[model samples]
Target: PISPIETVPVKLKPGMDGPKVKQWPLTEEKIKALVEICTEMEKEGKISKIGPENPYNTPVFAIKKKDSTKWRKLVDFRELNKRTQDFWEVQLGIPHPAGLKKNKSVTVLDVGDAYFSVPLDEDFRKYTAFTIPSINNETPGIRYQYNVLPQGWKGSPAIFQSSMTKILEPFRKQNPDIVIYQYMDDLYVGSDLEIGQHRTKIEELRQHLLRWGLTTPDKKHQKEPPFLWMGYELHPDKWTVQPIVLPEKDSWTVNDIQKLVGKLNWASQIYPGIKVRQLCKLLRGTKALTEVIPLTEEAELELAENREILKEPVHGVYYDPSKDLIAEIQKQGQGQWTYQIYQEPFKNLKTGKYARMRGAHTNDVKQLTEAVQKITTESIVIWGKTPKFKLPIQKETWETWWTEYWQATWIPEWEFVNTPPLVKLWYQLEKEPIVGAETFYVDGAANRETKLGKAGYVTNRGRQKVVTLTDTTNQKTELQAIYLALQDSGLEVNIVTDSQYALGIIQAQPDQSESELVNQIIEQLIKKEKVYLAWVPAHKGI
Candidate 1:
């Protein structure tokens, strides 16, 4: 229900009355202008002297009007409104210029003294009192409270909108075909219709709105195609929309860049495909207002590109429904730089010892450019810098080989002594086969074609035997010879072989061998009474 004054009473938040508002410096002329308006309001009974009960002081300031007619009186309710609350959500979905088709007849309606038209709740009116310094400039100012809702109060727009919406309820419901959209005090009516019908609908809405106290006496933006709405002038004759603002300057502060972003972003709504995002990317992560950003060579180049794009006029495309809506999607792949942090082992707070990269993809996927994203927190990312692919089938074994032994494994490389232990090459000249005890000439030979070799042995005491081995390589055959000779022997004997690869295998007797032949040679000699193992030159004449 509306107040007795035929309007909803504006609400003040039920909380702290806020600290005293700080007044800005004002000249005597500005002060006299403020006093002139306040006194006229007092005489009109719009504002009255504050009582002892409400001591909360809201500040006031004066700014020169655009027309230079008189000072524009602005209330410093910002300080008072800080501790206040809003009863409404205050979010209304406003239509954009690009939202509708290109050729639509539209016009906007604006309310005069919108918030002042609403009444202030009698209980809340005392808190709206603003303090203005006296004409003596230095003297403390007097407080004058408003009977009606003040423009800068926290709840003025919401209250005004709430009342305005209720007033237009019948008009909105009855004429559902006429689209009426309201954003606070601004109203717009638009539809796909002829010029006369558009003009009739606008007057119809304006007449309907006049029933209540709301009025649009200006009528400047109404009855035309080239009208202004929300501060944007939608083309004078044609429907094309282009950006209009400062072209070039020496430099820009952070504040100016931010302001330009808002304008450019709004421009994007009307004109698509501008580099607003790309050009503005460099302006991110700033935490200061006064910081000056200088345009470097690349920066200047990109800014020029943005300027050129914004300067171009853009018109909406005509949409058709009968045919298939076709858009040309393309494939021009310019690879982006995938960055990574390279760090060594360091102590962390929570977890255990840290290693390598969390993840990186295989440097290149050969068949298609579906370069996938890889995440590995452990650190070692192996996306090498080139495409290592022979063909599409190359991807088949990519993971199989790379994943298995890709990580470094410990291959023990030992420092071995140069000298051979307890073993020598018996040339029949250097170390004679132990003469008094016993002697033996042991040798093994193998053929690569047959791989069937013989391990032969002959003792000084005339004990001789030959063992034929299948599936034996050269070294195994030689080692097999020594193993066989050592087993069927008695007393001390120098079992010799010409094979270095196999002879060395037994000399080290390497406790245990991966090969059964060499391990048996070690064990067989282990049980012997005495033994001398050496490599005998097979071709030397004795």
Candidate 2:
């Protein structure tokens, strides 16, 4: 596409005698002094490289500042974007300042300023003159410099901008409700309220331009703005865009298909009404399970046309736009139907005795065991009384929490809080630790007296160990299990257990308020630096 531009010669303005000005360049001594100054300025953050770790910025423009050391080019646009209250899209039928102004008396107001820039060859540009002007906030004294190229003069855009700004200035000051923006020949004007005011401004600008030597082509000018600025299609009381059609087909590798499934699965969790799980049953892949979902007729035709041209196997089966309408309806309503499995917690055993297992004899293990023993695995079996309608229990999204819960609950009784097993210990050393924090691990199965497990497996991410717990159903047994593992490790230990009873036995007891726990943890974290015995949320995923 060719640009709509025609340039002419830049005639020198009257009363202007262009003269060359010389710049006294820097010497080696001066350069050294500048570096020293820049160093001091760095302390005040005056200058720094962009991504100092990576040489992405070449021929970098050093931003000088008093605090040069603090100056960093940590460019992150996401934060700035969040701060902008303006959104990309707004709901329809709602009154927005920009939306309301559409189709109303629209006007464009632009600002421009003229300046000079010496080219690299300062002497060469004496005859090759051009103008600099403000285009945007960032280009305070800059414009897209042009040269005598074909039909367009390099200075034409700058000249046009200046004229437009001059024309709109008077009208903008007069009308408060009028919206205005200008760039070269393109102008935008509209208003949600008092649209006539915007029209009046446009009229004034057009007249003023006639008075100055610029003309607004009658064919191009309109009572209402018909063009789009950015992506927004500006119209009277309405803004829209063409549908975003997916482009050229790409092959669906297993990873790609899995990723698509992952997104849909997450969406299903976030929006329970979406039945992607049922749809996944149809797709022919590792995820192939149930049935192939038929595609819409229109989509099927589309696929038929491009089937040879595009890649497959596609998502399960092509959806039939016509015949599968009833199936789509079924999927939509199925989300509300509660599955029997989701109604109750898993019953691992018929006997409820193990639900309240506690530690025995040993004071250390007795504390954790006693605290947890009363909290039954199915403590709310009776719900006291049958309430009204059945309320749905919200499912948890804590994948990490589940992993931790499984690790903690499946372990034997003999393992202590601090000691971990070899598998977990090796895994932690390979990958980075969670915030460089230690996990507790205890091997509960090693101790002969422990009865929680014939074979025990307990590991804590924090203690950095896999614990083999015992079958003993006692709290002291659990703590002793942890203490015994760490006792022979020949390292400083910090024992933290969620059980208040355990903490009471270890040190003086305090009020078990939320603030008290926080204060205690903070104090311990600050003072000890090692061997921390603060409570972690039970089965909490770090």
Candidate 3:
């Protein structure tokens, strides 16, 4: 329901009565002139290349005719009415704060530049006796001042804005789809499903501006086939940022400063401190901190010196996803940089301890700094870069393998994550051993091959299918098989895989080149409404 309103009684001042109402609709020629002004500003390099008056702070106005020639309706504050009223409000250059508190009957728009303006006079006295402090944080009340083109005002901007808006009438009418905003000069032309329609709208706007005296400049971009929108890049599927290099995992000896320096230099491409001079001081010192003292025995006078310096105190690390530092661990294979891990570690705060640990690993014990460095670096990437992926995988295993792999490549990484039995089980399944129940139990040595690659099943009870063991490392394929197996058993299925690549393949619409097995499995799962991926992890065991 519409709210009821009360009418205000009119009060009259002696000198401010108006005659008849008039409208100053902006002409095509005027819009062309405004465009030229914007172009001139661009040449001066004051604004973005877009041809809009002060493109960054373009003013806009809406106009309508009320009387023939006496007075003009400078702007339409009635925007709702203007849009729905089936008529256009002729525009001005830019919009301004309408200093109207309440509508007066003879509505005077005082563009008061001559008689009144905002700036102070030479004596610091304002003509209207107005003070900045009085207007500060003040809300509009019953004070209405509608004087357009007033005397001695510094608000020539208002007049300039009004003139520019009127001039763009031809452009506005021509390209209806091109949206105009208050500050941005260039009209934004776009639509999701109406690209062609919007394109036409833009062309019309351009032509209108050209005829009116404005030249619209088009932005040039490299043409490519249509690509996915809003993925990694802003324009399209283009990858603008260069890929980062993975850090060296070679063990660091006390003398392996050169290797560390080399890694840091490569990292400088992705890090700070390009000059090696900053780091040279730390490397020149070859002494270790602590030494066992021989006091009783005849020894050279013990010189006491404790000094340390760090170059590139702030350091950046890179870990390849194809290897240990992955966003998500995929099925076991030769892991590609399965996840690209990049992090910047610094010597300040807690990272100082970490840096010391890296140095200690390099100079002391059997393992070099690179061994511990790899673990510390991998940890930085794994824990820091992708927290979501790091949570589900076994933390204990992650921590253990994380260090062990650095210690020795021969060390099986899975050993750190689980008991040898679990590793054995996975290994058997991953390798698809030949022995099965028959040969392994008899020969003691596990058979190396009998399964058809990664996805065939063997039965103990023949057609009854007693043991339904999923012996494969292809996690997505395993998920699909589980879905089918569950359906056969009349049990609902729930599966999860961290591989987004796998999920993308599964959810992808049926097209050429996708495996038929995957298609069939997905179809059954969908038909039964049984297959679903629960992102949460349950207790881990067999």
Best by TM-score: 1
Q: Ten residues in a row with the worst lDDT in model 2?
A: 421-430
State the TM-score for model 2: 0.28
Tens-place lDDT digits, model 2, residues 1-542: 11123332343334343322221233444334444544543453223322212211111112334656432211122322232223222222222222132244454433211111101122212322212212232332211111212112234355454544555577787766565665444556666556455455566656655454344544253444434545334455444432222333344344443455564444332223333333344355444423234544454444344423222211111111122111000112211221111111221111111111112211211222222332222222322111111112111312222243322322112211221211110000111223333444443333455454322223344224444444444454444544543443233343444544444433422212133323343233333334434454444462
**TM-score of each model, paired residue for residue:** 0.50, 0.28, 0.19
Q: Write one digit per residue (lDDT tens) for candidate 1, span 371-398.
A: 2122121111222122111122132233
lDDT of each: 0.55, 0.32, 0.29
The best-first sequence of candidates by lDDT reads: 1, 2, 3
| Candidate 1 TM-score to native | 0.50
Residues forming the 10-long window of minimal summed lDDT in candidate 1: 346-355
lDDT, residue 427, model 3: 8
Error of 2 at 367 (Å): 35
lDDT of 3 by residue, 477-528 (tens): 4444443443453223333334333344333322122344554554554454
Index of the highest-lDDT prediction = 1
The superposed Cα distance between candidate 2 and the true structure at residue 430, in angstroms, equals 33
